[PDB]
Amino acid sequence: MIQGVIQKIAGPAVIAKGMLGARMYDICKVGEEGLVGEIIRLDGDTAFVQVYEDTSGLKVGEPVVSTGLPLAVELGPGMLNGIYDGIQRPLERIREKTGIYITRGVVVHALDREKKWAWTPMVKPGDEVRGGMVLGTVPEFGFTHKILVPPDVRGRVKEVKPAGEYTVEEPVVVLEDGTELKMYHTWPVRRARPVQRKLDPNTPFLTGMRILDVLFPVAMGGTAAIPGPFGSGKTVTQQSLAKWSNADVVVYVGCGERGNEMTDVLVEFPELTDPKTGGPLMHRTVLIANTSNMPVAAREASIYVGVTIAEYFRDQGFSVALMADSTSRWAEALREISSRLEEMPAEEGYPPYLAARLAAFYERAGKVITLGGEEGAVTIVGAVSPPGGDMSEPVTQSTLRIVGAFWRLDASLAFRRHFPAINWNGSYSLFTSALDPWYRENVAEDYPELRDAISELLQREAGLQEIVQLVGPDALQDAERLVIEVGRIIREDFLQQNAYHEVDAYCSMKKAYGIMKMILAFYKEAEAAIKRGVSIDEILQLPVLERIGRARYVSEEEFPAYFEEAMKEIQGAFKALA
Template structure:
């Protein structure tokens, strides 16, 4: 493992100080303590080294040994990278899972190889390569067909000296540790395997930096047409959290209710299985909201106000297009913005997930089930009070009952003696909840009789415990109906009989249907949870705690990059799990052949419940892998989601080092670190022969607190560095406009650099883009005038501008990701749609200038078929092929021209 050269002097969270560290270097990899926790030296002072540990440091103490490795934090680069998911320091999570014996937790100090040593790869020497020839760093020696998409080039490491080629292993199957070539360097022979290591903080050298010349196509018209990014460029996109309106009640793990604005970091909330979920982060978001109104069997249950990025926990018996079902359930995690875009027939099948406690939780589960029937009897008896006689009766019935159950029973009184159903009842096992309700219903003498909904069982409840009683009813499959003096429990007879007979453990229930109604703009509160990120509201419905970044994932699925490196830095674990579930089901078509998208993807997962310090390494691990793939001559897209969480890791370590804080507690060197990261993007002519050119495009997601990009130091520093900004707008999402990219706030500085490409392949595109942006900008000005004087007061040419701008917004910029024709838009289709819309616009403006009284209403009526074509052309299926679509577009153009010729006659 190494030589013991030091001992721990102090421990402060992820930062430790070790003494007797003579001979070590900055950024050197070390192992700490008996469990050999991975760490990195970040500061040296005399014989003491400050070490950033990438794992939980609980259990480390002064005097524990520190082991040196003599090398910096590095990654292994070679065949086997694609299709693998790593943690922040390139440990393969699938291998770790196998070693953990089925545990969902990563053991501390686990040490595994980043690349498989057992897999056999078909090694093929480079044709024409001769023994005795001179080779230099970066030269390609041979290839390995990693999969049907990636032909992996085996290169001389850039930090090698080079020399004379002594021998090359013949073609055949080999592991990555087998020697495949030997060089003679300065009189010594050096054997080289298929892989090599590279320090993550050192950019890989290139022969020459080149300007970007080709666009990175995303398949989203608003991005490809108006705000393009080059292959080798940098781009920023804001992420979002889903939040609740102030005043919303959530359930703590002990069953108590708490307002969302009172939730603190470290608070524990009730999970959908009855176990706790810990709050690990808080956020505030301002913007448009929606009210989620839930009903059971047609009767109102609850209302809760959320922002547009809030994630709904939806159950559906049928497949929800564009979303992946949680394994072994009917559950989907769907953001509000995505749900609004679903077809109506799909929405009709959806219901909100309900609370289901599968395991005993709380402090009262040891008591016999019948004791909870007794508690229900006392709750249902409206004449009960908190007199001494009642206390004596409780003791006589319960006897020497388990003390904690007695505490539960005492909690059924408020301070003034009013019967009170404690929220802790929600955390009880199903049988106990059923008995509690049975006692309340039986003592109420089953008043109300039969209805079309089943039986009505009035349960006397005070206003203070209506929420708890309703949630309890939903949790066992009943419909809670508020009535005078209490709560009625309704449901089909098969729901009621098990309750009253206390016989069946089966929990059958009516689905909780819901609708979304637009609300006003307001400030919402949110939080990030550990585990599965779900929690329970007092009404018994299950909610997710936050939203997700969507566009960066669509880039991974549909962009024209050769390979993708997706780095989830401090993001939610289920988001990375969703990527793992979605990507194997997605295909990318190249040269008419479909390939699984995982073949070109490498995932770096450092989730929010992993150690904070490892976040800082995950970004560098991802970009180093991307540079290695670039050196093969590939165009690589790297998604960093999100750089804000990476900056939080820097702030954490900076605080532990007692460094002087800057804006928002961030370290003063934040801007320099961000710039150094984004500078590793670019297009380059790489080292070695044969000549190769590759690129690394970096798309960084930022998640500013409260959505305030202007006041967040990470966002402002990022925007001063990147050349493209795709600004998301929640008001567009509220209007069901997706992608919700604000065309007035977003920008791209690559438009001039890409003009030679457009002039060569799409000669009219530049003029079309300029004209389209002018129309959208003019529309914004006209809408202000319309608010003052009305649309009828506008000039006729301005009316045309407003109408065509609406077509651009609704039929061009807006895309439906759940349809075959609009999920991905090839660039030739984008250009043709622009051409058709603007051709109609120019012809209409020209006709308006003809002699005589002309009006927009007359023009539109006379060319109504051609006008409708502008909306219909987007339904052309890309799968039909470019030739078929171009022919359809040419026919549409001819029809538009003919319509105006007929109008002129």
């Protein structure tokens, strides 16, 4: 380890002499208290260290020790059910050993070093292993955590620890070249974990919400952007997505949130229940929490820490949903760091490389073939919070250039008690065409046509808004009144979804397909009845209205019979009509 002494202190900037051999962006311990800093410039025998925490009280001549490694995360058993800050320090153990305040220079381990894990070997002496292979398994809540050899490590197995209880520091496998492999390894957060091959967006990411799964789908391994306007129910929708998605592991990243909003996340999330097991949802999620008053380095590194953890869980063969609660706050942290570096800004004070960093974060998503030969995916749902909802902000423009879906959350819809408050007019998805074969194979060959028909009906309803504003709906022709009423039905019975209801919180693709079938069949029958001289108000009184309105709340296993009965009675109700 390169060891030097402090030569100059100027705020968070420390110049350390005697540091020849220190590498750029290595983590350093500054002063007797061991404050963590990063090398950002090398000059002769000196190194420029940017200290994470406050440097008040430091004196010239205090030791500077280089760890020799860049910013990295420990990947191994013990991350699930854990809460970390932006640089992966366990907040609960920090509270245990320090109090209600976070003191400077506290040393904690990301993975617990005292807990014993039930090791089960899967390799034998003489076996040849490569990066990403499975050395063994360890139980962690409902999962079987696969211990992977690090991606850059290969060799022949010499000795394997038998089944038993060991800590993460115990060398379970040691290779012929003397390399010891433990239950965990470290990976730089700014280097993407290698994969064999990136797959195409063929399969959908099922969030359990009808509007998202049908109108604006995101592919497994895709990326979606959401806005967080106040009063839109963003937190309900985010935690509903966490509960009901088809992802095995959830990673939630809070980059520089408000103190009370971060408290809301940290209190509500442990109370969520996992429907797959009935236990706490926290048993399959990792929370990364940062408030606005934490060091800017941690707030900037939070998303990379989260995406690295997500990539590790993907490399174990799982499907991971990654949610970043505010990339706008992360961008603010990046802007502050660039300003501290005295870099010329681009547009509204942001560094010119803002789009490059956003792309480096978002492009780590995708369905891949892991180095171990299994299949895994990372799906990223990012959130943006412009100053006053003005999307023209460079962060939002940069995000929308690279994300495949945009779920426009609207406060006006939430004011009208339309939940989820997703404005279907401003939302879009680029994954529909790629996902169409999967829909035809897996739910119905008709499904894309039905989805386009429903979207066209919504567009026709939106095209009449100025007429309905100018004159009442009763002044509309029966054809226009029919599409207005069908748009109302579509909204209130397909688009709206109760996140707290016992059966309506989740909706499968087939149930949604049946609902659209019922709605479109009713619309076609009513359009025929209109040209049969039937007036609108007898159609609006049909019980099939209430039948379609109740289709949301019927359970999943009872839906097929309800759907066939409803189709039959919708066919019958219009035949008997005069």
